[PDB]
């Protein structure tokens, strides 16, 4: 089984797969590749969101202006939750468009992950190889090539750390949002966020 040959197994659940409900046992291998790809994407998005939400909760913002009328401090004033609503529309559209470009270019790689490729290994240069499209070759992950200095075992341990941190952030960001929605649901969040 493909579920028996991954890095996500951790001692926190013993030296064994954590599939309480047998979801991985009730699906074919292709769905397991999709699961790992989506798990890592969710984890990474979640930790980006978690650190961003903490930064917003601390009222930390850049010195300058997010538009020609709004200030970074002004749009951050209300809090992290309403900050996205207070962001100008064109900026939201631009973030969504660049995320669209990223998740289209990464999807359009033919080894893929569902059809015979490493799940979670986003192609480091999504926009390369596209005919009649040009990008500056800023490779998406490790643009300055930190992981090159690591050995294979080192980066395997760090992939395990990635899975652990991504799952923890998956919990954490939703903890932030749920604490904002239901007051006292997550007692660690003050009224500031």
């Amino acid at each position: 089984a493909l579920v028996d040959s991954m890095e996500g197994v951790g001692e926190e659940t013993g030296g064994q797969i954590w599939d309480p409900l047998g979801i991985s046992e009730a699906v074919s291998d292709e769905a397991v590749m999709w699961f790992r790809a989506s798990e890592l994407k969710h984890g990474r998005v979640a930790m980006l969101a978690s650190v961003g939400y903490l930064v917003g909760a601390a009222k930390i913002s850049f010195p300058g202006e997010l538009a020609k009328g709004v200030t970074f401090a002004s749009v951050a004033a209300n809090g992290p939750y309403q900050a996205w609503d207070a962001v100008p529309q064109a900026g939201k559209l631009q973030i969504l468009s660049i995320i669209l470009a990223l998740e289209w270019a990464t999807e359009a790689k033919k080894p893929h992950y569902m059809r015979g490729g490493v799940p979670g290994k986003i192609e480091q240069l999504p926009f390369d190889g596209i005919q009649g499209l040009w990008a500056p070759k800023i490779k998406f992950w490790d643009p300055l090539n930190f992981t090159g200095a690591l050995s294979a075992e080192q980066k395997a341990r760090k992939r395990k750390a990635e899975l652990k941190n991504g799952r923890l952030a998956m919990i954490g960001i939703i903890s932030f949002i749920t604490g904002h929605n239901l007051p006292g649901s997550v007692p660690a969040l003050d009224s500031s966020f």
Binding site: P136, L144, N145, F146, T147, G148, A149, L150
Partner: protein, 179 residues
């Protein structure tokens, strides 16, 4: 990291990296660090020399920054942040746009890119137009590269000293209280 330039006699003839930042760096990461260090050295040297020349009562440019908008170089202020604020927004925009065109040209026009097997922080587009170091020996060129890195790091320290003196009222000992 041990084969790169920048080390001098002032640190035991050895590398200065207390916090291990070079141990997590491959060849490409080290090239990026060197490119960033050199570009910061260049920018900081120009910045600190300009700030010193302006705020030290040095000569200013002759006439009008904007003949139409009515801003003389003397009336700009002879104070760094205040002068930059008083510069017209169009002037700042075209300075930054020219620098951006230069940066894009630098990235796209220096073949073997510094992050793909090229020399870090070299710009054949902008260096020695006339003749200056197109004929020097390969040991004096290395010596002057080391000098560049050294006094460039000193310029980084100096320009951030000026910035701290401006923001924090009196943070630098031997700098005025109105930087």
């Amino acid at each position: 990291v041990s084969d790169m330039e920048g080390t001098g006699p002032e640190t035991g003839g050895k590398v200065f990296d207390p916090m291990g930042l070079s141990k997590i760096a491959s060849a490409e990461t080290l090239a990026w660090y060197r490119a960033a260090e050199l570009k910061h050295s260049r920018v900081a040297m120009a910045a600190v020399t300009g700030w010193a020349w302006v705020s030290s009562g040095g000569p200013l440019f002759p006439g009008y920054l904007s003949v139409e908008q009515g801003v003389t170089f003397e009336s700009l202020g002879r104070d760094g942040y205040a002068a930059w604020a008083a510069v017209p927004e169009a002037g700042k925009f075209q300075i930054l746009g020219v620098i951006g065109i230069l940066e894009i040209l630098s990235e796209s026009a220096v073949k073997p890119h510094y992050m793909a097997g090229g020399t870090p922080g070299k710009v054949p587009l902008l260096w020695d137009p006339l003749g200056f170091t197109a004929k020097l020996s390969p040991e004096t060129l290395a010596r002057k590269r080391l000098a560049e890195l050294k006094n460039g790091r000193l310029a980084m320290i100096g320009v951030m000293s000026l910035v701290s003196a401006h923001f924090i009222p009196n943070s630098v000992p031997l700098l005025p209280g109105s930087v």
